[PDB]
Design a protein around this ligand. Structure first.
Ligand SMILES: [Mg+2]
Ligand SMILES: [Mg+2]
Ligand SMILES: [Mg+2]
Lengths: 377, 377, 378, 378
């Protein structure tokens, strides 16, 4: 069955995503999501054709067989080059590409990981991103108290690894950041890996160098979003100077950017996002490039149960990576995280099951969607 | 006076553009234009704030002094990193940045070129892009026949240089393209510089190499858009193999990409667009990098009279460049080209005057604008 | 209104000297800057006769021009003086005029100069304050420490975030004694301020420098300045790669071409191209962009007059890549020009210095002091 | 005997000027040099007051010293003036003095300066002769060629092996017209003399130069000089790799540090650092060694006075890596200083010029002329 329609469905809650729904001639549909401001992303998908490199993105897949992942990706990418190629246009390709793996999977009656090359590990072991709910201008001390229940729950579930964050705070010194992360290591203990997301705190690599030299003894597994995203040279200098993994490419799009990060900086973990960088088809190309560089691919993953299902299948395929980033409802109370999808797999001993349900295995809360979009489904 | 509003105005002729209009406290306003699908760019400019790196672009400049180009550019760029940084999001920055030069110029009563560093050549001598009006499926000979009147008109105006194109056409062999371009040299003669826009015909650099080897005797000034935009390695091998200027970066955004092209390919002409790449503030930064590499900067210029005014002011500052690209109403009958702006400078002996009217010296055709938008300006 | 005259005004107090550069437009509004160099010789430089295409009097590149046009005017000064300029002392003269054109254009338009430099990009200006003590030759290191104490105390009192101390050149003293000297100063300074060190070109062998600053890792220097000879790019690159903090360079250089070579070849983390030497504010802006790409900081060397202090305040507030810039403040130095040439110097308040929206550079010149030392009316 | 005084003597004729540097020893024996730059300014530079460690009066590094000690004396001059020297105009001043010391030391010991430069390493000095036509501004390319004819005929009559011709700076004329002009000049020169071209910094875009010199491949230029802007090292390297002859550079540079950066980055095949700019003979000799490593030639810019001509004769006989050196000969130029400042200039004989073994530089100064134009007694 060939593709008949593509729909970008904004989901705004008073917290937002764009559901990408791709339907075939039999009425079977695949789901995915695209990053970006939802009404803007919808307008992007409904533009009128202009010339050879500026076409409505949908027209590159209407009438096509969703199995043909490379052909469809290249077609979307080529016909929209003038408004795409990098950035927001790639978000929209990502969403459709994700929905194509779900659709083709449901058409064939096979789980998406099979269409991604096949399971290459016995188990999926994520690292769990812990972000605490606190007030603006909450102090470092209050943030640590808020982290306690989250960290306690990760232990209770047997998590192998957790990431904590530095909430952006320019009223606080790097020496106070050092004490803050030393404290968090104490609370986490030494039976889980500890990653830090710096959330772009630093601009001077030598100031980051000072900090993470102080912290060598808390044995960080990786340091993420340390310096500004454009500053490749600062990254390469920092990575050569520290004694663990530096991450990068969180906000990037395409294998081309991923590859430049790898070539230029020596980051050991690449974070190109499922719903930003061009999607699963492009992530698979980035995996093969990561492998040559002996780098891990842990795609940024902080959206909805739709992306979580894409991470489950890609995760069981991505043999080069010990962990992938995971947003689990046990640790986050966002309305979409709790309500958009149903029957989210439980964390058992630090692992989550990847079911062999056809496609991405997504159980959408259709009634919740119809409720909030006000439009029927 | 501080900026009070920013409006993105779709102009769509039933040919399109987005007019960006930025108004200060005294009701004085500046005009720029942004590339991209017009309704989609509007939606972009009207998004809601979500977080540190995802804010409504307008909010980075409302309440700010438009004189402060670097600060305003940086704030726009920084507060929109999550959806900008490259691609569509940078178009929206460009339009505003363009407007800001127009506005800051009217506020102070000085032409924009003075705020861009000051005039550094006696005269602006552009190269004129000539695209023929022909039926799709036109033969190469019919295209040449449509070129003859255009080229004769350019000679009549004293044009120092012209660019001709290869209309995308996969039913025609490279051997036929060679004959086609030889015939165009005969028609142009040996008193004007001849540039060629390949419109991304080639994928294999060796096939391009064959073509431009046969053509060494027609003495092309540059070859533009010869290979696929992502293929830096193909460009670098081609530029080293040929005996003139290779261009690139026509579709690229930011100085980071322009600099990557220069470093890796050794292209001799950078073509970052006024209304795509970040705008005039970024182009000035690209200009400095080009100077280091002894490359020329000839920004892609194919929109409206609004961008034309930008090219005039930028052209007169850009001392590293013998020419800049220019779409002149003498050579193109597109509606926006003919009607959106009033009192376009005439081509006199190959030159176009840059006036010292305040700002960009844009005379908007407001009647026309109200006629097509359905709303009062 | 166009520029009508340029004047280089030597100022020598009977060593305390500068060259004041005054650029005056058609309405009699003027802009002030200052040039580095031997004052009477800089004056002769500005008064030379024309000779050929790349050897012209420097004033003639700007007389009759709009001071708003920074790039065009800079480029015209640089090109028409290439034969005697390009690098070095010729560049001091361009720096002085460039500085004054920011002050003049700002005065013409009624705006502070930082607006003409792109606009403010930090909430506050937080310099590091250079502390040089007043002592005899053959002051032992112990006496230099004593002399430092009241200076370091005053910076603490003003809430300084950072201070730089110096190794007065002394070849009767071992590196072992230098290590103790610096350990002492860190003790006196405390751990609530960043500590920078100016080596004043003590070392020639990078391996000897390497030994010294390996011992000093525990005092946590923020940067190490003027460590090796200024020409020795290879020694700097080897030292930078060996140590564990920032190495500085380019203090004596002129032009973005030299700055960029330093960056490429050595990996210095802090570039010290001087306001009144390297080409001026227009050239420092180009250098800033180049530093940005290399993730280096730009902290222009600043040890002249309150005329340069003003340029540092405005450039400081625009230079977002740099956490600090070098600052000479009257609280810490008792030189006659520092104390008397300008009035009403902004006070240090919680380590910060106010950059006002006073037009141009916001310079308050002591007219009667200048008139008295020069001997001619202003 | 030790040096007792150093004097910088402006010679400004009513562009026709130079600065004569005269260094006198305890017995009243003197050496002569000259320094580039505006004469009254170079005098002020030489007469400045000491200020600090890297800022001293240049004369004070050599007064009381033995003139035989070229490296020590150069290094001293260079180190004690770094703050205002290092690159550019300050290096001119060093150059003039360095030159004078070769003359003085040679007169002291009764040897020709070439011996103090390591000894003669070629049988003959065969210069290339720079031919510059006396024409009006507004001269057409045709009128320029017509003024070139009697010059070029003169060179042939002298048996010259090589001449350089120039592109007078002319933005009204196209490269296609420059191509015709240079082809016409090769017809006039013929095929028995090497032909060099001075582009006088016409080009800014290397790809435009590339176009021009590709057309001219069949006139077989020996070298192409000053083709692109002096700072633009990357355009030079690209142009050097594209053409099929020698590209020159570094005409305006100072020090071995720049000459070495040109050679490393660009692959120029001829270095042109100037006797009276770059540092002098002592620095030229160091540049010679770096040229040898790179298999580049060293042909120092030589368009000054007979004083520099004598240095070029002495250096030229030592500089075995170079087939030719640049020479301004009075047969080909009517400049007042060229004709009058010095006496008994060596004649051109079958394209060669004698290097005498008169002591030092073998300069015969026209004292009367010099006393006439300075007003002072010599
Ligand atoms: Mg094009
Ligand atoms: Mg210092
Ligand atoms: Mg020359």
């Amino acid at each position: 069955a060939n593709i008949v329609s593509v729909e970008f469905i904004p989901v705004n809650v008073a917290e937002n995503t764009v559901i990408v729904k791709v339907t075939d001639e039999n009425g079977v549909y695949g789901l995915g999501e695209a990053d970006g401001p939802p009404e803007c992303m919808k307008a992007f998908s409904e533009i009128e054709n202009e010339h050879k490199w500026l076409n409505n993105i949908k027209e590159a897949v209407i009438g096509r067989d969703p199995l043909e992942f490379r052909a469809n990706y290249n077609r979307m990418y080529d016909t929209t080059k003038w408004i795409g190629m990098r950035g927001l246009g790639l978000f929209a390709i990502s969403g459709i590409d994700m929905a194509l793996y779900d659709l083709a999977g449901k058409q064939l009656g096979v789980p998406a990981y099979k269409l991604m090359g096949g399971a290459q590990k016995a188990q999926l072991t994520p690292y769990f991103t812990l972000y605490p709910s606190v007030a603006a201008d909450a102090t470092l001390s209050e943030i640590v108290e808020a982290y306690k229940p989250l960290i306690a729950k990760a232990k209770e579930r047997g998590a192998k690894a957790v990431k904590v964050c530095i909430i952006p705070n320019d009223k606080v010194s790097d020496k106070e950041i050092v004490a803050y992360l030393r404290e968090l290591r104490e609370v986490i203990g030494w039976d889980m890996d500890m990653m830090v997301d710096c959330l772009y705190r630093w601009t001077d690599w030598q100031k980051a160098r000072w900090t993470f030299r102080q912290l060598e003894d808390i044995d960080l597994y990786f340091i993420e979003a340390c310096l500004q995203h454009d500053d490749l040279i600062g990254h390469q200098k920092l990575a050569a100077a520290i004694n663990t993994r530096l991450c990068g490419a969180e906000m990037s799009t395409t294998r081309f950017e991923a590859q430049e990060w790898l070539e230029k900086t020596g980051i050991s973990v690449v974070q190109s996002d499922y719903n930003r960088c061009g999607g699963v088809t492009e992530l698979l190309r980035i995996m093969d490039i990561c492998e040559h560089h002996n780098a891990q691919l842990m795609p940024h993953n902080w959206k909805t149960g739709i992306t979580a299902a894409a991470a489950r299948h890609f995760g069981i395929v991505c043999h080069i990576s010990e962990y992938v980033e995971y947003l689990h409802p046990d640790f986050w109370n966002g309305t979409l995280t709790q309500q958009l999808t149903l029957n989210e797999p439980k964390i058992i001993d630090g692992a989550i099951e990847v079911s062999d349900k056809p496609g991405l295995g997504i159980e959408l809360n259709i009634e919740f969607v119809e409720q909030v979009t006000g439009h029927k489904f």
